[PDB]
Design a protein around this ligand. Structure first.
Ligand SMILES: Nc1nc2c(ncn2[C@@H]2O[C@H](COP(=O)(O)OP(=O)(O)NP(=O)(O)O)[C@@H](O)[C@H]2O)c(=O)[nH]1
Ligand SMILES: [Mg+2]
Length: 296
């Protein structure tokens, strides 16, 4: 009879496991993940429907001090993610004590204390040496939050968190139909993000942060083969050379890894063509940002 529905923002500094947590809460990979401290750049909605209850999760960019136009967009994305939700999941890395970036998040959540439930989720319990001490320090930054320690990779602990969040949703009609996709994004966007993820993990120094991607063509082909053409943009000529690599070895590595992940997630054959292009300092180009989808 009755139905419950709400939004849950997932926030925290970069690299704590926010996107990993979302994918595991949903049971399907919808968000890019990488070991680099600036992977997510735009809010991403993950739709969880369980029985008569629905949660629209909002993954967000890691909170940080903006350095350029892209950073400003990202900062605005976090701010807007926190404007109207029914609960907030603040993810922290239990492997170390709070950093100034974590304190930045605690500060951003103060106005929500007492207004919306805040769950302080300590992540990476599996790799933390001093989980308890770390968790205690994080909690002192926002005493009002409900603390818990887990690994976003642990099925049982994540399922427990999911149950606790569903019980917090207010009565109301579902925001999305119960048969809606697991995330609110186009197939093209999802593919471009998978490619960016594989690129970021295989590039170093400043290059990962200069990478943007876009799918320009998707089409049925060959013998049940899905054809995909995508562009990997960089900000400068020296980066293009490095992404391509000696004899095109680097871009081939990236392309192969992306094709294989795509085939494993889609369960079908994929033929992927990649082209590397320079989009002149696009992170500072308002027009470029709009073309690339970082619009607002
Ligand atoms: N050992 C361990 N690693 C984890 C866990 N959860 C996430 N990670 C790792 O932490 C890194 C960052 O995870 P990710 O989900 O991209 O973090 P994020 O908070 O979304 N980063 P950003 O804000 O930049 O988008 C990845 O290498 C990921 O595999 C966990 O429970 N245990
Ligand atoms: Mg992320």
């Amino acid at each position: 009879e009755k139905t419950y529905s709400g939004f849950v923002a997932i926030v925290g500094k970069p690299n704590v496991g926010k996107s990993t947590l979302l994918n595991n809460l949903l049971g399907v990979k919808v968000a890019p993940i990488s070991p680099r401290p600036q992977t997510t750049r735009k809010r991403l909605r993950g739709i969880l429907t369980e029985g008569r209850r629905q949660i629209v999760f909002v993954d967000t960019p890691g909170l940080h001090k903006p350095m350029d136009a892209l950073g400003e967009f990202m900062d605005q994305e976090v701010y807007e993610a926190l404007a109207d939700v029914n609960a907030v999941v603040w993810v922290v890395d239990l492997r170390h004590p709070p950093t100034p970036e974590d304190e930045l998040v605690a500060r951003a959540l103060k106005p929500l204390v007492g207004k919306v439930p805040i769950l302080l989720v300590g992540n990476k319990l599996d790799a933390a040496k001093y989980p308890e001490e770390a968790m205690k320090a994080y909690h002192e930054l926002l005493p009002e939050a409900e603390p818990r320690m887990l690994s976003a990779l642990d099925e049982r602990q994540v399922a427990e968190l999911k149950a606790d969040l569903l019980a917090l949703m207010p009565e109301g009609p579902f925001f999305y139909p119960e048969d809606y996709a697991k995330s609110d994004q186009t197939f093209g966007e999802w593919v471009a993000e998978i490619l960016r993820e594989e690129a970021m993990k295989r590039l170093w120094h400043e290059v990962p942060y200069a990478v943007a991607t876009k799918v320009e063509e998707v089409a049925e082909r060959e013998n049940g083969v899905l054809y995909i053409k995508a562009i990997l943009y960089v900000e400068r000529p020296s980066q293009k050379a490095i992404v391509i690599g000696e004899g095109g070895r680097k871009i081939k590595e990236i392309g192969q890894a992306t094709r294989k992940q795509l085939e494993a997630l889609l369960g079908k054959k994929v033929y992927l063509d990649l082209e590397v292009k320079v989009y002149p300092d696009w992170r500072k180009d308002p027009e470029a940002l709009r073309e690339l989808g970082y619009r607002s």
